[PDB]
Design a protein around this ligand. Structure first.
Ligand code: MYR
Length: 130
């Protein structure tokens, strides 16, 4: 849809603080901090796939909106994830060990804007089409 495409990271604010708030260690934070991933979003029927590709780490999720799924995150958390579409925003919640984090993906002008929140930390990541 508006989301389908291949997207390259062009800016990131507060990602180190976000990773720290998630409990990510120095080594995994080091890998993530200067990474410039591509995010490849596709859809087949009910199933949306989001691939995140970078030199040192790749991830992929496939899901149906509103259906919880198990996910191993890029930082190796074992979480239960649910993704819904609310006002054109893909809203992902991840739940583990009594905690939660949200990842909200929206289209704004030429940008795919990704807001990641853990407790009082808000990170904003911007991708543009490859
Ligand atoms: C790209 C490599 C980063 C690996 C470090 C751990 C990151 C875990 C949280 C990732 C949140 C997703 C943000 C996004 O899709 O831009």
């Amino acid at each position: 849809d508006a989301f389908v495409g291949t997207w390259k990271l062009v800016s990131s604010e507060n990602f180190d603080d976000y990773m720290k708030e998630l409990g990510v260690g120095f080594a995994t934070r080091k890998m993530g901090g200067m990474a410039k991933p591509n995010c490849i979003i596709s859809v087949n029927g009910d199933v949306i796939t989001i691939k995140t590709e970078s030199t040192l780490k790749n991830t992929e999720i496939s899901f149906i909106l509103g259906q919880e799924f198990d996910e191993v995150t890029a930082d190796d958390r074992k979480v239960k994830s649910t993704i819904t579409l609310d006002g054109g925003v893909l809203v992902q919640v991840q739940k583990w060990d009594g905690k939660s984090t949200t990842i909200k993906r929206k289209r704004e002008d030429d940008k795919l804007v990704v807001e990641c929140v853990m407790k009082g930390v808000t990170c904003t990541r911007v991708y543009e089409r490859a």
